[PDB]
């Protein structure tokens, strides 16, 4: 179906222990394809998917050049942010940046995004029109004034509507086997006594791709959302994902309880039962 | 493949 390309950047200051740690990764949907780490020896943007390996030396040289330019930008940001917030030289702080584009089923531009965080909280974000900014506090207002005066939004919009979508389509084509696939979850439920009066029912979804999934428990058709323990969707390590949902029920009531699985790989949503 | 910025 639909697709996304996203770059993620994390810079962490390390005061009196050298320069900040910078890590960049790029994803198409839930498949990583590149990385850069400022502490690594290579000092190169590196391949992390088989279908990006075919990119020639101009790609590798230019992507390394650009990622190093992003790293320098964040080095400056960390100093500026400490000034904006009247913070001391002492403590470690974190800047995060994410940008990228979505396309539909037909691979045409759906939407673009470009967002910053400082110390885990929204700082400034490009709005959906790609023409204006949401600044989360007074310090991010200062950035907004500067980014408006410099016409930063216009430069981002041209990238997100053009280059971003251009490279996404290219990746979807070259890595079609990996990227344009759907692996439906293999589903089952497990049952284990916790005492002589209660049992854990755990609904499992395995070996699925993409990561987006919904798992829910119903009792006599009623959602059991506050009684459900739902783990974060986790990577198997082979390019697929896993998730579970559990409820603890009275022994004897198992047949009231059903697990409900939705995933784009399923021809229909599944209902799993204890009878 | 990456984007031509400081806060």
């Amino acid at each position: 179906g639909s697709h996304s390309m996203r770059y993620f950047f994390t810079s962490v200051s390390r005061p009196g222990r050298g320069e900040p740690r910078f890590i960049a990764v790029g994803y198409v949907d839930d498949t990583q394809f590149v990385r850069f780490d400022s502490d690594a020896a290579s000092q190169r943007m590196e391949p992390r998917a088989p279908w990006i390996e075919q990119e020639g030396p101009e790609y590798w040289d230019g992507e390394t050049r650009k990622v190093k330019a992003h790293s320098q930008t964040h080095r400056v940001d960390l100093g500026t942010l400490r000034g904006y917030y009247n913070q001391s030289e002492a403590g470690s702080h974190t800047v995060q940046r994410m940008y990228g584009c979505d396309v539909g089923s037909d691979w045409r531009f759906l939407r673009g995004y470009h967002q910053y965080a400082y110390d885990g909280k929204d700082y400034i974000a490009l709005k959906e029109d790609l023409r204006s900014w949401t600044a989360a506090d007074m310090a991010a207002q200062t950035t907004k004034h500067k980014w408006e005066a410099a016409h930063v939004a216009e430069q981002l919009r041209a990238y997100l509507e053009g280059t971003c979508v251009e490279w996404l389509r290219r990746y979807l084509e070259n890595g079609k086997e990996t990227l344009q696939r759907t692996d439906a979850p293999k589903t089952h439920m497990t049952h284990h006594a916790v005492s002589d009066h209660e049992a854990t029912l755990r609904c499992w979804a395995l070996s699925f791709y993409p990561a987006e999934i919904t798992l829910t428990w119903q009792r006599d058709g009623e959602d059991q959302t506050q009684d459900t323990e739902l783990v974060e969707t986790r990577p198997a390590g082979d390019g697929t994902f896993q998730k579970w949902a559990a409820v603890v029920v009275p022994s004897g009531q198992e047949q009231r309880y059903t697990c409900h699985v939705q995933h784009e790989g399923l021809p229909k949503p599944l209902t799993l039962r204890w009878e | 493949x990456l984007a031509x910025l400081t806060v």
Partner: protein, 100 residues
């Protein structure tokens, strides 16, 4: 400063079967800041040849990492993941439970 606690999960890639090679995973997600110590344990001892994913993050800005190693499950061997982070007042051990 915002701090978010790592949610830690320890699990095998494939259903475990004694004598059959597999991959042991410790996935830590939902955490902030990014400084974190994650070790896989085998009968209480640190496994040496452990790899991890590149630092990435979710829509809410919280970080995630996968740590992993090849292993062959047996009857007697006990596996665990040990995590320290600013949010944890001491290292947290999560034991591998194959019967989940």
């Amino acid at each position: 400063m915002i701090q978010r606690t790592p949610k830690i999960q320890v699990y095998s890639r494939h259903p475990a079967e004694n004598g059959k090679s597999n991959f042991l995973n410790c996935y830590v997600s939902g955490f902030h800041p990014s400084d974190i110590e994650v070790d896989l344990l085998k009968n209480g001892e640190r496994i040496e040849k452990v790899e991890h994913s590149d630092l990435s993050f979710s829509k809410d800005w919280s970080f995630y990492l996968l740590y992993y190693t090849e292993f062959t499950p047996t009857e007697k061997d006990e596996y665990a993941c040990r995590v320290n982070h600013v949010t944890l007042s001491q290292p947290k051990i999560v034991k591998w439970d194959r019967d989940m």
